[PDB]
Design a protein around this ligand. Structure first.
Ligand SMILES: Cn1cc(CNCC2CCN(c3ncc(C(=O)NO)cn3)CC2)c2ccccc21
Ligand SMILES: [K+]
Ligand SMILES: [K+]
Ligand SMILES: [Zn+2]
Length: 404
Protein backbone atom coordinates (compact mmCIF):
# COMPACT_ATOMS: atom_id res chain seq x y z
CA UNK A 1 0.00 0.00 0.00
CA UNK A 2 0.89 3.69 0.30
CA UNK A 3 1.36 4.77 3.91
CA UNK A 4 1.18 8.23 5.47
CA UNK A 5 2.25 9.21 8.98
CA UNK A 6 -0.36 10.99 11.09
CA UNK A 7 -2.20 10.95 14.39
CA UNK A 8 -3.95 13.43 16.68
CA UNK A 9 -1.05 13.98 19.05
CA UNK A 10 1.41 13.95 16.15
CA UNK A 11 -0.58 16.72 14.50
CA UNK A 12 -0.65 18.78 17.70
CA UNK A 13 3.13 18.47 18.13
CA UNK A 14 3.98 19.15 14.46
CA UNK A 15 1.90 22.35 14.77
CA UNK A 16 3.59 23.53 17.97
CA UNK A 17 6.60 25.39 16.56
CA UNK A 18 6.77 29.17 16.04
CA UNK A 19 8.46 28.80 12.63
CA UNK A 20 6.06 26.37 10.95
CA UNK A 21 2.85 27.15 12.87
CA UNK A 22 -0.14 25.14 11.61
CA UNK A 23 1.41 24.20 8.23
CA UNK A 24 1.15 20.44 8.89
CA UNK A 25 -2.56 20.78 9.71
CA UNK A 26 -3.25 22.57 6.41
CA UNK A 27 -1.35 19.84 4.56
CA UNK A 28 -3.20 16.93 6.14
CA UNK A 29 -6.60 18.63 6.05
CA UNK A 30 -6.19 19.42 2.34
CA UNK A 31 -5.31 15.76 1.69
CA UNK A 32 -8.40 14.83 3.73
CA UNK A 33 -10.59 17.36 1.90
CA UNK A 34 -9.61 15.74 -1.42
CA UNK A 35 -10.79 12.35 -0.07
CA UNK A 36 -7.31 10.78 -0.24
CA UNK A 37 -7.13 9.48 3.35
CA UNK A 38 -9.22 6.33 2.59
CA UNK A 39 -6.62 5.41 -0.06
CA UNK A 40 -3.70 5.57 2.42
CA UNK A 41 -2.51 3.34 5.27
CA UNK A 42 -2.06 5.37 8.46
CA UNK A 43 1.41 4.74 9.88
CA UNK A 44 1.45 5.55 13.64
CA UNK A 45 4.49 7.48 14.89
CA UNK A 46 6.92 5.27 16.80
CA UNK A 47 6.66 5.32 20.59
CA UNK A 48 9.09 3.67 22.98
CA UNK A 49 9.01 1.41 26.04
CA UNK A 50 11.22 3.68 28.15
CA UNK A 51 13.27 6.87 28.18
CA UNK A 52 16.34 4.67 27.75
CA UNK A 53 14.96 3.14 24.56
CA UNK A 54 14.09 6.59 23.21
CA UNK A 55 17.62 7.83 23.95
CA UNK A 56 19.12 4.77 22.29
CA UNK A 57 17.16 5.50 19.12
CA UNK A 58 17.95 9.21 18.89
CA UNK A 59 21.63 8.80 19.87
CA UNK A 60 22.10 6.37 16.98
CA UNK A 61 23.03 9.69 15.34
CA UNK A 62 22.95 12.57 17.85
CA UNK A 63 25.23 12.90 20.87
CA UNK A 64 23.81 12.23 24.32
CA UNK A 65 24.96 15.66 25.46
CA UNK A 66 23.11 17.37 22.59
CA UNK A 67 19.90 15.41 23.30
CA UNK A 68 20.28 16.28 27.00
CA UNK A 69 20.63 19.97 26.12
CA UNK A 70 17.63 19.92 23.79
CA UNK A 71 15.48 18.32 26.50
CA UNK A 72 16.75 20.83 29.09
CA UNK A 73 15.94 23.66 26.68
CA UNK A 74 12.30 22.53 26.62
CA UNK A 75 12.16 22.32 30.43
CA UNK A 76 13.63 25.81 30.75
CA UNK A 77 11.09 27.26 28.31
CA UNK A 78 8.24 25.77 30.37
CA UNK A 79 9.35 27.97 33.29
CA UNK A 80 8.92 31.74 33.31
CA UNK A 81 12.39 32.69 34.57
CA UNK A 82 15.10 33.74 32.14
CA UNK A 83 17.97 31.40 31.36
CA UNK A 84 21.07 31.67 33.48
CA UNK A 85 24.25 32.85 31.76
CA UNK A 86 25.68 29.33 32.16
CA UNK A 87 22.60 27.86 30.50
CA UNK A 88 22.78 30.40 27.65
CA UNK A 89 26.41 29.37 27.03
CA UNK A 90 25.45 25.69 27.08
CA UNK A 91 22.72 26.22 24.48
CA UNK A 92 25.07 28.31 22.35
CA UNK A 93 27.57 25.42 22.29
CA UNK A 94 24.97 23.32 20.40
CA UNK A 95 23.70 26.26 18.25
CA UNK A 96 20.37 26.18 20.12
CA UNK A 97 19.82 29.88 19.55
CA UNK A 98 18.90 32.59 17.04
CA UNK A 99 17.71 30.42 14.16
CA UNK A 100 16.96 27.38 16.35
CA UNK A 101 15.60 28.91 19.56
CA UNK A 102 13.83 27.28 22.45
CA UNK A 103 10.09 27.10 22.87
CA UNK A 104 7.91 25.18 25.34
CA UNK A 105 7.59 22.06 23.16
CA UNK A 106 10.91 22.19 21.29
CA UNK A 107 11.95 18.67 22.30
CA UNK A 108 8.57 16.99 21.75
CA UNK A 109 8.21 18.80 18.40
CA UNK A 110 11.67 17.70 17.19
CA UNK A 111 11.26 14.19 18.55
CA UNK A 112 7.88 13.82 16.85
CA UNK A 113 9.45 14.06 13.37
CA UNK A 114 11.93 11.33 14.38
CA UNK A 115 9.01 9.20 15.63
CA UNK A 116 7.19 9.60 12.31
CA UNK A 117 10.14 8.93 10.04
CA UNK A 118 11.40 5.90 12.00
CA UNK A 119 7.91 4.37 11.91
CA UNK A 120 7.81 5.08 8.16
CA UNK A 121 11.15 3.30 7.66
CA UNK A 122 9.88 0.30 9.64
CA UNK A 123 6.74 0.09 7.49
CA UNK A 124 8.98 -0.18 4.42
CA UNK A 125 11.33 -2.72 6.01
CA UNK A 126 8.51 -5.07 7.03
CA UNK A 127 6.97 -4.59 3.55
CA UNK A 128 3.62 -3.31 4.88
CA UNK A 129 3.90 -0.30 2.55
CA UNK A 130 5.68 0.13 -0.77
CA UNK A 131 5.86 3.91 -0.21
CA UNK A 132 5.42 5.91 2.99
CA UNK A 133 4.83 9.67 3.23
CA UNK A 134 5.72 11.81 6.27
CA UNK A 135 4.87 15.47 5.79
CA UNK A 136 5.96 16.16 9.39
CA UNK A 137 9.54 15.10 8.68
CA UNK A 138 12.45 16.02 6.41
CA UNK A 139 14.70 18.08 8.74
CA UNK A 140 17.90 17.69 6.74
CA UNK A 141 20.14 20.36 8.38
CA UNK A 142 20.51 19.04 11.95
CA UNK A 143 23.94 17.62 12.81
CA UNK A 144 25.20 15.15 15.41
CA UNK A 145 25.59 17.85 18.11
CA UNK A 146 24.21 20.97 16.40
CA UNK A 147 20.83 22.44 15.54
CA UNK A 148 20.79 24.24 12.22
CA UNK A 149 18.43 25.87 9.77
CA UNK A 150 15.29 25.42 11.92
CA UNK A 151 16.17 21.69 12.29
CA UNK A 152 16.81 20.22 15.73
CA UNK A 153 16.89 16.44 15.23
CA UNK A 154 17.71 14.76 11.92
CA UNK A 155 14.80 12.38 11.34
CA UNK A 156 16.15 11.68 7.84
CA UNK A 157 19.54 10.42 9.01
CA UNK A 158 17.88 8.26 11.65
CA UNK A 159 15.38 6.82 9.15
CA UNK A 160 18.15 6.09 6.63
CA UNK A 161 20.27 4.46 9.34
CA UNK A 162 17.37 2.13 10.13
CA UNK A 163 16.95 1.29 6.45
CA UNK A 164 20.61 0.55 5.69
CA UNK A 165 20.98 -1.53 8.83
CA UNK A 166 18.12 -3.75 7.63
CA UNK A 167 18.71 -6.68 5.31
CA UNK A 168 24.17 -5.48 0.61
CA UNK A 169 21.62 -2.79 1.36
CA UNK A 170 22.14 0.54 -0.41
CA UNK A 171 20.00 3.65 0.05
CA UNK A 172 19.72 6.49 -2.44
CA UNK A 173 18.83 9.84 -0.82
CA UNK A 174 17.39 12.56 -3.09
CA UNK A 175 17.04 16.05 -1.59
CA UNK A 176 14.70 18.30 -3.62
CA UNK A 177 14.69 21.19 -1.09
CA UNK A 178 15.75 24.69 -2.15
CA UNK A 179 18.67 24.34 0.26
CA UNK A 180 21.61 21.96 0.32
CA UNK A 181 20.93 18.80 2.37
CA UNK A 182 24.15 19.26 4.37
CA UNK A 183 23.25 17.36 7.54
CA UNK A 184 22.36 14.13 5.72
CA UNK A 185 25.34 14.44 3.37
CA UNK A 186 27.70 14.92 6.33
CA UNK A 187 26.26 12.02 8.31
CA UNK A 188 26.99 9.62 5.45
CA UNK A 189 30.17 11.25 4.12
CA UNK A 190 32.21 8.09 4.79
CA UNK A 191 29.53 5.53 3.81
CA UNK A 192 29.33 4.17 0.24
CA UNK A 193 26.06 2.39 1.06
CA UNK A 194 24.08 5.64 1.40
CA UNK A 195 24.48 7.72 -1.77
CA UNK A 196 23.22 11.27 -1.27
CA UNK A 197 22.12 13.62 -4.06
CA UNK A 198 21.02 17.21 -3.41
CA UNK A 199 19.80 19.71 -6.00
CA UNK A 200 19.57 23.22 -4.59
CA UNK A 201 20.37 26.88 -4.99
CA UNK A 202 23.84 27.96 -3.95
CA UNK A 203 25.32 31.46 -4.05
CA UNK A 204 27.52 33.67 -1.82
CA UNK A 205 25.95 34.14 1.61
CA UNK A 206 23.01 31.81 0.86
CA UNK A 207 22.28 29.15 3.54
CA UNK A 208 23.99 26.80 4.41
CA UNK A 209 26.83 27.48 1.96
CA UNK A 210 27.83 23.92 1.01
CA UNK A 211 26.82 21.74 -1.96
CA UNK A 212 28.98 23.69 -4.40
CA UNK A 213 32.54 24.44 -5.51
CA UNK A 214 34.94 24.40 -2.58
CA UNK A 215 36.66 21.69 -6.74
CA UNK A 216 33.68 19.63 -5.61
CA UNK A 217 34.19 17.55 -2.49
CA UNK A 218 32.22 14.33 -2.77
CA UNK A 219 32.89 12.03 0.22
CA UNK A 220 35.90 10.52 1.95
CA UNK A 221 37.41 7.17 2.81
CA UNK A 222 35.25 4.35 1.51
CA UNK A 223 32.60 7.03 0.88
CA UNK A 224 34.66 8.86 -1.75
CA UNK A 225 32.47 9.86 -4.75
CA UNK A 226 29.30 8.94 -2.85
CA UNK A 227 28.03 12.50 -2.20
CA UNK A 228 26.45 14.18 -5.26
CA UNK A 229 25.45 17.83 -5.63
CA UNK A 230 23.83 19.96 -8.33
CA UNK A 231 23.77 23.70 -7.53
CA UNK A 232 21.48 25.74 -9.77
CA UNK A 233 21.09 29.44 -10.44
CA UNK A 234 18.15 31.45 -9.22
CA UNK A 235 15.15 31.77 -11.52
CA UNK A 236 15.07 28.20 -12.88
CA UNK A 237 11.66 26.98 -14.11
CA UNK A 238 9.96 23.57 -14.05
CA UNK A 239 11.29 22.37 -17.41
CA UNK A 240 14.92 23.40 -16.99
CA UNK A 241 15.05 22.01 -13.44
CA UNK A 242 13.47 18.74 -14.65
CA UNK A 243 15.91 18.42 -17.53
CA UNK A 244 18.75 19.22 -15.12
CA UNK A 245 17.84 16.52 -12.59
CA UNK A 246 16.22 13.83 -14.79
CA UNK A 247 19.24 12.09 -16.34
CA UNK A 248 21.11 12.27 -13.02
CA UNK A 249 18.28 10.46 -11.21
CA UNK A 250 18.01 7.79 -13.89
CA UNK A 251 21.75 7.18 -13.95
CA UNK A 252 21.96 6.99 -10.14
CA UNK A 253 19.25 4.32 -10.10
CA UNK A 254 20.89 2.30 -12.89
CA UNK A 255 24.33 2.31 -11.28
CA UNK A 256 23.51 2.16 -7.57
CA UNK A 257 20.50 -0.18 -7.82
CA UNK A 258 19.20 1.06 -4.42
CA UNK A 259 17.29 -1.13 -1.98
CA UNK A 260 15.43 1.97 -0.76
CA UNK A 261 14.98 5.56 -1.90
CA UNK A 262 14.44 8.42 0.56
CA UNK A 263 13.23 11.69 -0.99
CA UNK A 264 13.20 15.06 0.79
CA UNK A 265 10.51 17.20 -0.86
CA UNK A 266 10.96 20.62 0.75
CA UNK A 267 8.52 22.99 -0.93
CA UNK A 268 10.64 26.16 -0.90
CA UNK A 269 11.49 25.79 -4.61
CA UNK A 270 7.93 26.93 -5.43
CA UNK A 271 7.73 30.18 -7.37
CA UNK A 272 5.39 31.45 -4.61
CA UNK A 273 7.60 30.62 -1.65
CA UNK A 274 8.62 33.87 0.11
CA UNK A 275 12.22 32.92 -0.74
CA UNK A 276 11.32 33.34 -4.43
CA UNK A 277 14.57 31.75 -5.63
CA UNK A 278 13.37 29.00 -7.99
CA UNK A 279 10.17 29.10 -10.10
CA UNK A 280 8.82 25.58 -9.70
CA UNK A 281 5.09 24.95 -9.60
CA UNK A 282 2.64 22.27 -8.55
CA UNK A 283 1.11 22.14 -12.05
CA UNK A 284 -0.05 18.76 -13.44
CA UNK A 285 -1.07 19.14 -17.11
CA UNK A 286 1.88 23.28 -20.46
CA UNK A 287 4.36 23.23 -17.55
CA UNK A 288 4.78 20.07 -15.46
CA UNK A 289 5.81 20.61 -11.83
CA UNK A 290 9.47 19.74 -11.40
CA UNK A 291 8.52 18.07 -8.11
CA UNK A 292 5.86 15.89 -9.74
CA UNK A 293 8.26 15.03 -12.58
CA UNK A 294 10.92 13.90 -10.12
CA UNK A 295 8.61 11.90 -7.87
CA UNK A 296 6.98 10.16 -10.83
CA UNK A 297 10.43 9.22 -12.16
CA UNK A 298 11.65 7.95 -8.78
CA UNK A 299 8.44 5.93 -8.29
CA UNK A 300 8.77 4.37 -11.79
CA UNK A 301 11.74 2.44 -10.40
CA UNK A 302 9.42 0.38 -8.12
CA UNK A 303 11.91 0.63 -5.21
CA UNK A 304 10.47 0.99 -1.65
CA UNK A 305 10.46 4.75 -1.10
CA UNK A 306 10.21 7.19 1.82
CA UNK A 307 8.80 10.61 0.89
CA UNK A 308 9.47 13.36 3.44
CA UNK A 309 8.60 17.05 3.80
CA UNK A 310 11.05 19.84 4.69
CA UNK A 311 11.09 23.55 3.91
CA UNK A 312 8.08 25.44 2.65
CA UNK A 313 7.15 28.83 4.05
CA UNK A 314 4.01 29.54 2.00
CA UNK A 315 1.78 27.18 3.97
CA UNK A 316 -1.27 26.98 1.64
CA UNK A 317 0.94 26.48 -1.42
CA UNK A 318 3.02 23.85 0.40
CA UNK A 319 -0.29 22.05 1.07
CA UNK A 320 -1.25 22.48 -2.60
CA UNK A 321 2.02 20.84 -3.68
CA UNK A 322 2.14 18.00 -1.15
CA UNK A 323 -1.51 17.13 -1.82
CA UNK A 324 -0.62 16.63 -5.48
CA UNK A 325 2.50 14.65 -4.51
CA UNK A 326 0.28 12.45 -2.35
CA UNK A 327 -2.28 11.90 -5.14
CA UNK A 328 0.49 11.11 -7.65
CA UNK A 329 2.03 8.57 -5.27
CA UNK A 330 -1.33 6.80 -4.86
CA UNK A 331 -1.85 6.74 -8.63
CA UNK A 332 1.64 5.44 -9.45
CA UNK A 333 1.78 2.78 -6.72
CA UNK A 334 -1.79 1.45 -6.94
CA UNK A 335 -2.30 2.04 -10.69
CA UNK A 336 -5.55 3.77 -9.77
CA UNK A 337 -6.47 7.13 -11.27
CA UNK A 338 -6.78 9.94 -8.73
CA UNK A 339 -8.89 12.81 -10.02
CA UNK A 340 -8.47 16.08 -8.14
CA UNK A 341 -10.87 18.99 -8.66
CA UNK A 342 -8.99 22.15 -9.74
CA UNK A 343 -11.16 23.83 -7.08
CA UNK A 344 -10.21 23.64 -3.38
CA UNK A 345 -13.01 21.68 -1.65
CA UNK A 346 -14.77 23.12 1.37
CA UNK A 347 -13.15 22.19 4.70
CA UNK A 348 -11.77 23.69 7.93
CA UNK A 349 -9.01 25.72 6.29
CA UNK A 350 -10.81 26.74 3.07
CA UNK A 351 -10.44 30.46 3.83
CA UNK A 352 -6.64 30.09 3.72
CA UNK A 353 -6.77 29.38 -0.03
CA UNK A 354 -8.41 32.65 -1.09
CA UNK A 355 -8.93 34.74 -2.98
CA UNK A 356 -9.47 32.22 -5.81
CA UNK A 357 -9.47 28.84 -4.03
CA UNK A 358 -7.77 26.88 -6.82
CA UNK A 359 -5.38 23.95 -6.46
CA UNK A 360 -2.79 25.38 -8.87
CA UNK A 361 -0.51 27.90 -7.23
CA UNK A 362 -1.11 31.45 -8.44
CA UNK A 363 1.81 31.86 -10.81
CA UNK A 364 2.44 32.48 -14.51
CA UNK A 365 5.55 30.64 -15.74
CA UNK A 366 8.14 31.94 -18.20
CA UNK A 367 11.73 31.20 -19.22
CA UNK A 368 14.50 30.71 -16.69
CA UNK A 369 16.58 33.77 -15.81
CA UNK A 370 19.87 32.28 -17.10
CA UNK A 371 25.97 25.18 -20.67
CA UNK A 372 26.58 25.35 -16.93
CA UNK A 373 24.20 22.40 -16.57
CA UNK A 374 26.10 20.48 -19.27
CA UNK A 375 29.38 20.93 -17.38
CA UNK A 376 27.72 19.66 -14.19
CA UNK A 377 26.35 16.63 -16.04
CA UNK A 378 29.84 15.79 -17.33
CA UNK A 379 31.25 16.17 -13.81
CA UNK A 380 28.49 14.10 -12.19
CA UNK A 381 28.84 11.36 -14.83
CA UNK A 382 32.57 11.17 -14.15
CA UNK A 383 31.92 11.06 -10.40
CA UNK A 384 29.36 8.27 -10.89
CA UNK A 385 31.91 6.31 -12.92
CA UNK A 386 34.47 6.85 -10.14
CA UNK A 387 31.93 5.74 -7.52
CA UNK A 388 31.10 2.59 -9.50
CA UNK A 389 34.78 1.72 -9.98
CA UNK A 390 35.73 2.29 -6.34
CA UNK A 391 32.84 0.08 -5.25
CA UNK A 392 33.23 -2.58 -7.99
CA UNK A 393 29.74 -2.05 -9.39
CA UNK A 394 29.07 -3.12 -13.00
CA UNK A 395 27.10 -0.91 -15.37
CA UNK A 396 26.88 -0.16 -19.08
CA UNK A 397 28.94 3.02 -19.47
CA UNK A 398 27.11 3.91 -22.67
CA UNK A 399 23.55 3.11 -21.59
CA UNK A 400 24.27 5.55 -18.76
CA UNK A 401 26.08 8.11 -20.92
CA UNK A 402 23.23 8.04 -23.47
CA UNK A 403 20.78 9.22 -20.77
CA UNK A 404 22.30 12.69 -21.23
C1 LIG B 1 16.24 38.39 10.32
N1 LIG B 1 17.09 37.41 10.99
C2 LIG B 1 18.29 36.93 10.52
C3 LIG B 1 18.80 36.02 11.38
C4 LIG B 1 20.08 35.24 11.23
N2 LIG B 1 19.90 33.93 10.63
C5 LIG B 1 19.14 33.93 9.38
C6 LIG B 1 19.45 32.74 8.49
C7 LIG B 1 18.56 32.76 7.25
C8 LIG B 1 18.77 31.53 6.38
N3 LIG B 1 18.56 30.30 7.14
C9 LIG B 1 17.68 29.34 6.75
N4 LIG B 1 17.75 28.16 7.40
C10 LIG B 1 17.05 27.16 6.85
C11 LIG B 1 16.29 27.27 5.69
C12 LIG B 1 15.68 26.11 4.97
O1 LIG B 1 14.61 26.21 4.38
N5 LIG B 1 16.41 24.99 4.94
O2 LIG B 1 16.07 23.90 4.14
C13 LIG B 1 16.26 28.56 5.16
N6 LIG B 1 16.94 29.59 5.67
C14 LIG B 1 19.40 30.21 8.34
C15 LIG B 1 19.22 31.43 9.23
C16 LIG B 1 17.87 35.92 12.47
C17 LIG B 1 17.84 35.19 13.66
C18 LIG B 1 16.77 35.33 14.53
C19 LIG B 1 15.73 36.20 14.23
C20 LIG B 1 15.74 36.94 13.06
C21 LIG B 1 16.82 36.79 12.19
K1 LIG C 1 18.14 20.12 -1.87
K1 LIG D 1 27.66 8.84 1.17
ZN1 LIG E 1 14.84 24.76 2.56
Amino acid sequence: SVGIVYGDQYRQLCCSSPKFGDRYALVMDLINAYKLIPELSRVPPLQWDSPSRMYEAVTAFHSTEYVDALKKLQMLHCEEKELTADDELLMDSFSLNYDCPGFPSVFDYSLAAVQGSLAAASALICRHCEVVINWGGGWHHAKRSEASGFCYLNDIVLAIHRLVSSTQTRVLYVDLDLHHGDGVEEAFWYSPRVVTFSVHHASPGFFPGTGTWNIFLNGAGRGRFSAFNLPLEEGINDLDWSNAIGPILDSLNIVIQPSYVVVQCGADCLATDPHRIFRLTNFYPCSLSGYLYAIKKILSWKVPTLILGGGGYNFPDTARLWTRVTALTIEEVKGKKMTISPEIPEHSYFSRYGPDFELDIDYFPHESHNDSIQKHHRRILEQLRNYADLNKLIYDYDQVYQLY
